[PDB]
Amino acid sequence: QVQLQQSGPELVKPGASVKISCKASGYALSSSWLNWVKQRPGQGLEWIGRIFPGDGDTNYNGKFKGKATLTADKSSSTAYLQLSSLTSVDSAVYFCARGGTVVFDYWGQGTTLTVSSAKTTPPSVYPLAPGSAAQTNSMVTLGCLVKGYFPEPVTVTWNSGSLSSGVHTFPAVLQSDLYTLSSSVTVPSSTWPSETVTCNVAHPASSTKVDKKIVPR
Amino acid sequence: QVQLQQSGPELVKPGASVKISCKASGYALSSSWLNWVKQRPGQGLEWIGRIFPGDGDTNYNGKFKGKATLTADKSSSTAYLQLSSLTSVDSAVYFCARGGTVVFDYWGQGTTLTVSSAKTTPPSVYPLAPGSAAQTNSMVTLGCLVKGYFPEPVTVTWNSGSLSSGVHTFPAVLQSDLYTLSSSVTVPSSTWPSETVTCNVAHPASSTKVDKKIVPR
Amino acid sequence: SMNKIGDDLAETISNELVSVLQKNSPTFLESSFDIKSEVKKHAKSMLKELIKVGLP
Amino acid sequence: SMNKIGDDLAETISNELVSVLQKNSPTFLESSFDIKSEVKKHAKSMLKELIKVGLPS
Amino acid sequence: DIVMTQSHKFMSTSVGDRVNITCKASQDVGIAVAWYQQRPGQSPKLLIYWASKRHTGVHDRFTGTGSGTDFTLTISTVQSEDLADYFCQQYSNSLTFGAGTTLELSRADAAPTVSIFPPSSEQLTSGGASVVCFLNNFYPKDINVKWKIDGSERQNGVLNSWTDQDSKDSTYSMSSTLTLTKDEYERHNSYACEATHKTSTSPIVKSFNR
Amino acid sequence: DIVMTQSHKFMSTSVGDRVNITCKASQDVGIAVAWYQQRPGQSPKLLIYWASKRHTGVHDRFTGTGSGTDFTLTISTVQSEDLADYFCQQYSNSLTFGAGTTLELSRADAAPTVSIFPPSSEQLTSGGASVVCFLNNFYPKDINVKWKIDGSERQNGVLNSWTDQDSKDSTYSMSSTLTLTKDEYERHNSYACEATHKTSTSPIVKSFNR
C-alpha cells in the first residue's frame, strides 16, 4: 500500500521556523527522489526542492535557496522540509511527492502552513438586514458578516439547519491579518420579518459560537 | 628482444635434488603460464608442470606430481623447477616455455641434468687395429675406443687434425652409468704402417688428454 | 567455470546501471526488479560476445 | 556526465575479461593492449544499449 | 524564467462529452510536459508525462497531445471523476507549473439575484462599516461587479469571494464587501452595487440611501 | 593416456620439393594439435597450433592440416633451414607429445664400408674385451646389424651409436661394440659382424679369427 504520510498543520508567528516531516511506505526512498511543492491557496503550484535520501543530494529552486532546507533520515523512511523566516507569502499548502527528478508519480496529503501575527481571535458577527426599500418582493435575502477571526475555519448555519435551501456561505477572505466570511439566505418574504431568522456562526478554534437574530433595524 | 634464460647444467647423485631457474624478459610473467618439459636422450618429449605466477596456481602431470614442484618470484621475473628423488631416468634436458596452458609460443634454451653416482674419471683409450688379415686393401680403416669416462664430452682428432676428412666420430653411449665412444679413419693402405696414425682424445672435465698411436695386430 | 565470473560481472554491470538510471531518471522507474533482470540478462549475452573478440 | 560511469564500467569489464582470458587460454594472448581496447570499445557501445532498456516508451 | 500559461481558467463540458484543456509555453519546451489532476480536497495526481505518455492506472480517456510551445490534454468522455482542476507542467530546464484550469459543468444562462445591505449599527459603533452585496445563482462565472458611492466609482476597500459551482443547480454565487471607516461612510448618501453580465445589456443595479 | 605416434622416424626430401610429416593419434583429439620444429642443438619452436593455424612469424611454407586421429604438416618448399626435427602434440584433454620425425636430405643409395677390430692387448689385461665393428657412409639410415660368435647369434652386451646425416656426403655411419668379459672372449675363436641393407641381398659380413 503506497502512502506518503506528512505532519499536521502548522500555525506559526511570522519570522519563525517550521520543520515538516514526510514519511513514506510501500517503496524505498533510498532509491528515489522526494520533491516539495508549494500550492498557494487558490493560485498555482511552485516547486521548492528535492532530495535523494540514499545519496543525500539536494537540488533547490533559486527562489528558495536561502529559505528552504531539505534533509532526510535514510533509516526512518522520512525526509523533512525546513522553512525559516516565514512571512504571509509562505502561507500555503506544502506537499511532498515521490518521483524522478521532475515528474511526480504520487503526491502526499499537503501540510497547511499559516503564518500570522494574530492570536486566536473570535469573529465579530454583524447582522445584514435590508432597508425599508423593496423590489422583487417574492423572495427576501438576509445575511451575516463573520469578521475579524483567526484562525480558520468557520461553520455557518441558519436556524440551526432548519433553513438549508437557498443558502450561500462564502469562503473567507484574508482581510487585515484576519479572516472574513459573509453568508446569505433567501426565504419568501411572506414569513419575514414575520418569522425569526438567526446567524449561527461557530469558530471551533476559540470555541466561540454565535446565535444572532436578523432584525429590520 | 623476448627471451627466457635458464640456469646452467647440473650434476646430481641419485637420491639428491636440484633447483632449475628460468628468468623471463620481454613480457610479463604475471600475465602468462610458464611450462616445464622433459626431453630425454631417446628424444621422447614429456610435459612436467606449469604455474601462473601472477596467482601462483599450479598444475602437474600425475607422473611427476610426487617429486616435481614449481614456485615463482614475481618480483624477479623468475620461475623455479625443483626436482627431488633424482635417478638416471630423470637425466634429460629440461626446457621452460612461455605460452598459455598448452601452446608453447616461445621456448628457453634448456638445462642439462646428468644424474649418476660416477665421479670425474678419465677415459680408457684403446687402439683399434685389424688383425693379420688383409681387408679390402685399397683403403685401411683404423680406430680408437674412448671408454669409461664421466662426465661428457670428449674431443677426438686424428694426427692432431692433420688427418682431417674421411673420419667418423660417434656420440657416446651408456655403459654402467659411464660414457663410451669410438672413432674411425680411412687413410689409404700405402700410408700406414709406414706413416704413423694417432688419435688425440681429450676430456676437459678431467683435463686428461690422450695421444696414442695405432699399432698393428 | 567460464561462466562463474561472467554472471558476477553481469551482476555488477546490471545493478550499477540501475543505480545511475534511478538517480538521473526524470521519472520514478517503478518495477525496478524487471528493469534489472532485463539488463542482467542482456548483460550476460553482451559478455559472451565481448569474450569472443579474443579469438585465436 | 552521462559517460562518467559508462567509461568506468567499460574499464572494469575490459580488465576482468582479459585477466580471465589470459589465465584460461591455452594460447598466450599476444598484444593484450589491443585485445582490451576492442573489448572496451565493444563494452562501451553495448553499455549504451543496456542502459536504454530503462524507459524507451 | 519560463511561463506555462493555461489560457482558460475554466472549461465548460457536460457528462459524456468531449473536452480539451490547453497549455502554452513561452518558449520551446520539447515534449517535456506533464499534466496533473487535483480534485478539491485531494493532492495532485499524474495523468500525462513527456506530454503524451499515459501514467500507470490512468484510464485511456486521458489522451495527451503535445510538442513544442503548444500542448493539449483531451478527455475522451467526461464523467464525475473529471470535474477537477488540471495543471500543465514544464520540466525541460526547470519547473514551471501552469496557471491551472477548472473543468465545470455547462448549463443554460442564468442571471444573478443581487442584494445590497448597509453597514450595521453594531459595526458603526465600533468605527467600522461594511457595505455587503451578494450576487447569487448565476452562470457563466464571467461576472464583473462595480461599486459606486454617490454615483461615483469605488475600486479600493473591496474584497470579493466566490463559491464553486453549486452541486444541485450548476450555478455560481459571489459575495462582495465594501469596507469603509465610519468617518467616510457617513460622508456619503447613495450606495450601489452594479453587476455586468451576459444575461442583461443593462448592468444589474440595486441601491440604498440614508 | 592418449598416444601420438609419428610413424616415420625419418622423411626424405630435397631443397625445393614438398614434404608431408604425418602424426597419428590413438584417440580423437579434435583439432587440438600443435607442431614444433627443433634444429640440432636448439630448443623447439612453434609452427602450428589448433592443427592448422600459423603462429606469428611462420612462413607460408608451413601449411598444417587435419582433425581427428590423423594430422599433417605440409612444407611447400624445403629450405636448408627446414632440415630439422619435427614433433606433434595433442591437448584435447591432456598433453602428449610425439617422439618426432627427422627430415633428411635424399641421395642415391649408398652401401656401407665395414671394418672389424678385436679387443686390444691392453684391454685384455684389464679383464674386459670390446669387439668393434664400424659401418660408415651408407644411405638410407635403415640398416640392421647382428653379431655372430662362432656362427651363433649375439644380442646382449652390444652397444650401438649413430651419426647424423653427413653435411659433405649425405650419408650415415654406425658404430657397434660387442663388450664381453675376457673369459667369454678367450673361450671363443671366430668373431663376425653382419649387416642387412637395401643395397645388397647378401648381407655385408667381415670376420676376425684368433
Q: In Å, how far is C14's CA from the nearest CA of chain D?
A: 9
Q: How many residues does chain B have?
A: 217
Residues F125 and F204 in one domain: yes
A213: which strand partners?
A: A198
Instruction: Mark yes or no for CB contact D27/B32 under 8 Å.
Output: no
* B-chain residues near F123 (CB < 8 A): 124, 126, 145
Write phi, then psi, for D54 (nearest 5 degrees): -65, -70
Neighbours of chain C (3+ CB pairs under 8 A): A, D, E, F
Instruction: Mark yes or no for CB contact C9/D21 under 8 Å.
Output: no
Instruction: Mark yes or no for CB contact A102/C22 under 8 Å.
Output: no
B174/B148 Cα distance (integer angstroms):
9
**In the structure, do chain F and chain E come into contact, i.e. share 3 or more CB pairs under 8 Å?**
no
E177, E159 contact by CB (below 8 A): yes
- By three-state DSSP, how is residue A169 classified? strand
Gaps in chain C after residue (C–N beyond 2.5 Å): none
Residues A150 and A70 in one domain: no
DSSP assigned state of A128: E
Question: CA dist B80 to A132, B6, B52, B93, F199, Å?
Answer: 123, 9, 12, 15, 52
- Nearest Cα residue to A145 out of A157, A163, A127, A160: A127
Domain boundary, last residue among F105, F121, F142: F105
* A-chain residues near E94 (CB < 8 A): 61
Kindly compute the dihedral angle of the four CA atoms of residues C30, C31, C37, C43, in this order, to the nearest 10 degrees: -10
Neighbours of chain E (3+ CB pairs under 8 A): A, C
* F-chain residues near B45 (CB < 8 A): 87, 89, 97-100
**In the structure, do chain A and chain B come into contact, i.e. share 3 or more CB pairs under 8 Å?**
no
- Nearest Cα residue to B33 out of A151, F175, D27, A216: D27
Q: In Å, how far is C38's CA from the nearest CA of chain E?
A: 20
Pairing verdict, β B139-149 and B124-128: antiparallel
Q: Which domain holds residue A203?
A: 124-213
Write phi, then psi, for C42 (nearest 5 degrees): -60, -40
Q: What is the CATH number of the domain that holds E9?
A: 2.60.40.10
A93/E41 Cα distance (integer angstroms):
12
C46: which strand partners?
A: none
Write phi, then psi, for B25 (nearest 5 degrees): -150, 160
Sort D19 into a burial class: Cβ within 10 Å, 0-12 / 13-18 / 19+: middle
E29/E34 Cα distance (integer angstroms):
11
DSSP strands (E only) in A40-175? 45-52, 57-60, 68-73, 78-83, 92-99, 104-107, 111-115, 124-128, 139-147, 155-158, 167-169, 173-175
Q: Residue F170: how many CB atoms within 10 A of its CB?
A: 16
Q: Which domain holds residue D19?
A: 4-53
Kindly compute the dihedral angle of the four CA atoms of residues E4, E9, E62, E72, in this order, to the nearest 10 degrees: -40
Instruction: Mark yes or no for CB contact C19/A31 under 8 Å.
Output: yes
DSSP assignments along B73-91, one per residue:
EGGGTEEEEEE-S--GGG-
Domain boundary, last residue among A82, A97, A115: A115
F107, F89 contact by CB (below 8 A): no
Would you call E49 an interface residue with chain C, using a CB distance cutoff of 8 Å?
Answer: yes
Instruction: Mark yes or no for CB contact F98/B61 under 8 Å.
Output: no
* B-chain residues near D25 (CB < 8 A): 100-101
- Nearest Cα residue to E44 out of A96, A63, A48: A96
Instruction: Mark yes or no for CB contact C28/A102 under 8 Å.
Output: no
* E-chain residues near C26 (CB < 8 A): 32, 49, 91
**In the structure, do chain E and chain C come into contact, i.e. share 3 or more CB pairs under 8 Å?**
yes
- By three-state DSSP, how is residue A23 classified? strand
What phi-psi label fits residue E171: left (phi over 0), alpha (psi between -120 and 50 degrees) or beta?
Answer: beta
- Nearest Cα residue to B43 out of F162, F48, F26: F162
Would you call F53 an interface residue with chain C, using a CB distance cutoff of 8 Å?
Answer: yes
Cis ω before B193 (30° cut-off from 0): yes
Opening angle at CA E82, ends E80 and E85, nearest 5:
130
A49/B11 Cα distance (integer angstroms):
83
Pairing verdict, β B10-12 and B111-115: parallel
Residues E150 and E204 in one domain: yes
Sort B137 into a burial class: Cβ within 10 Å, 0-12 / 13-18 / 19+: exposed
Instruction: Mark yes or no for CB contact C35/D53 under 8 Å.
Output: yes
Residue D10: alpha-carbon gap to chain centroid:
4
Instruction: Mark yes or no for CB contact D27/F49 under 8 Å.
Output: yes
Nominal resolution (angstroms): 3.5
Domain boundary, last residue among F87, F105, F123: F105
Instruction: Mark yes or no for CB contact F43/B107 under 8 Å.
Output: yes
Q: Which three cell numbers stand for residue F70?
A: 590423423
Domain boundary, last residue among B89, B115, B141: B115
Domain tally, chain A? 2
Tell me the count of B-D CB pairs closer than 8 A: 31
Query: Within chain E, what is the greatest distance between any pair of CA atoms?
Result: 64
Instruction: Mark yes or no for CB contact D51/C2 under 8 Å.
Output: no
Residues E72 and E126 in one domain: no
Sort C49 into a burial class: Cβ within 10 Å, 0-12 / 13-18 / 19+: exposed
**Percent composition of chain D: helix, strand, coil (DSSP 3-state, to 5):** 75, 0, 25
* D-chain residues near F32 (CB < 8 A): 26
Residues B40 and B13 in one domain: yes
- By three-state DSSP, how is residue F93 classified? coil
Residues E69 and E142 in one domain: no
Residues B15 and B106 in one domain: yes
DSSP assigned state of D55: S
Domain tally, chain D? 1
Query: Which of A61, A107, A131 lies closest to E45 in CB terms?
Result: A107
Domain tally, chain F? 2
Query: Which of E32, E46, E161 lies closest to A170 in CB terms?
Result: E161
Residues B48 and B17 in one domain: yes
Tell me the count of C-D CB pairs closer than 8 A: 64
User: How many Å is the Cα radius of gyration of chain C?
Assistant: 13
Q: Which three cell numbers stand for residue B99?
A: 605460452
Please count the helices (runs of H) and the strands (runs of E) in chain D. 2, 0
Residues E17 and E84 in one domain: yes
Question: Which uninterrupted H or E stretch holds F60?
Answer: none
Residues F190 and F146 in one domain: yes
A111: which strand partners?
A: A94
Q: In Å, how far is C42's CA from the nearest CA of chain D?
A: 7
DSSP assigned state of D26: S
DSSP assignments along B108-168, one per residue:
---EEEEE-SPPSBPPEEEEE---SS--STTEEEEEEEEEEEBSS--B--BGGGTS-SSEE
E198/E46 Cα distance (integer angstroms):
36
Residues F144 and F92 in one domain: no
Residues B102 and B143 in one domain: no
Domain boundary, last residue among F71, F105, F139: F105
Residues F144 and F74 in one domain: no
B144/B159 Cα distance (integer angstroms):
13
* C-chain residues near D54 (CB < 8 A): 21, 25, 29, 35
Q: Which residue's C-alpha cell is 612469424?
A: F57
Would you call A105 an interface residue with chain C, using a CB distance cutoff of 8 Å?
Answer: yes
Query: Which of C19, C26, C32 lies closest to A100 in CB terms?
Result: C26
A23/A178 Cα distance (integer angstroms):
33
- Nearest Cα residue to F136 out of F106, F158, F163: F163
Residue E103: how many CA atoms within 13 Å on its side-chain side? 27
Q: Which three cell numbers stand for residue B92?
A: 634429460
Helices (H), chain F: 123-126, 182-186
Residue by residue, what is the 3-state secondary structure of chain E? CCCEECCCCEEEECCCCCEEEEEEECCCCCCCEEEEEECCCCCCEEEEECCCEECCCCCCCEEEEEECCEEEEEECCCCHHHCCEEEEEECCCCCEECCCEEEEECCCCECCEEEEECCCHHHHHCCEEEEEEEEEEEECCCCEEEEEECCEEECCCEEEEECCCCCCCCCEEEEEEEEEEHHHHCCCCCEEEEEEECCEEEEEEEEECC
Residue F65: alpha-carbon gap to chain centroid:
25
Would you call E48 an interface residue with chain C, using a CB distance cutoff of 8 Å?
Answer: no
Q: What is the CATH number of the domain that holds B49?
A: 2.60.40.10
F119/A120 Cα distance (integer angstroms):
140
- Nearest Cα residue to E132 out of E197, E62, E68, E179: E179
Terminal CA-CA length for chain C: 20
Please count the helices (runs of H) and the strands (runs of E) in chain A. 0, 20
B92, B113 contact by CB (below 8 A): yes
What phi-psi label fits residue D9: left (phi over 0), alpha (psi between -120 and 50 degrees) or beta?
Answer: alpha
Q: Residue F205: how many CB atoms within 10 A of its CB?
A: 13
Would you call A107 an interface residue with chain C, using a CB distance cutoff of 8 Å?
Answer: no
Q: Which domain holds residue E36?
A: 4-105
* B-chain residues near D30 (CB < 8 A): 105
What phi-psi label fits residue A15: left (phi over 0), alpha (psi between -120 and 50 degrees) or beta?
Answer: left
Question: CA dist C35 to A63, B85, C15, D54, Å?
Answer: 36, 62, 10, 6
Pairing verdict, β F19-25 and F70-75: antiparallel
Q: Which residue's C-alpha cell is 580423437?
A: F28
* F-chain residues near C55 (CB < 8 A): none
Residues E171 and E83 in one domain: no
A153/A202 Cα distance (integer angstroms):
9
Residues E117 and E100 in one domain: no
Question: Which uninterrupted H or E stretch holds D10?
Answer: helix D4-23
**In the structure, do chain F and chain A come into contact, i.e. share 3 or more CB pairs under 8 Å?**
no
Query: Which of B54, B55, B102 lies closest to D26 in CB terms?
Result: B102
Gaps in chain A after residue (C–N beyond 2.5 Å): none
B103, F34 contact by CB (below 8 A): yes
* E-chain residues near A135 (CB < 8 A): 206
Residues F97 and F37 in one domain: yes
Query: Which of D22, D24, D27 lies closest to B31 in CB terms?
Result: D22
Closest chain F residue by Cα to residue D27: F49
Q: In Å, how far is B141's CA from the nearest CA of chain D?
A: 54
Would you call F138 an interface residue with chain B, using a CB distance cutoff of 8 Å?
Answer: no
Cis ω before E140 (30° cut-off from 0): yes
F52/F31 Cα distance (integer angstroms):
8
B162/B151 Cα distance (integer angstroms):
27
Closest chain C residue by Cα to residue A31: C22
What phi-psi label fits residue A85: left (phi over 0), alpha (psi between -120 and 50 degrees) or beta?
Answer: left
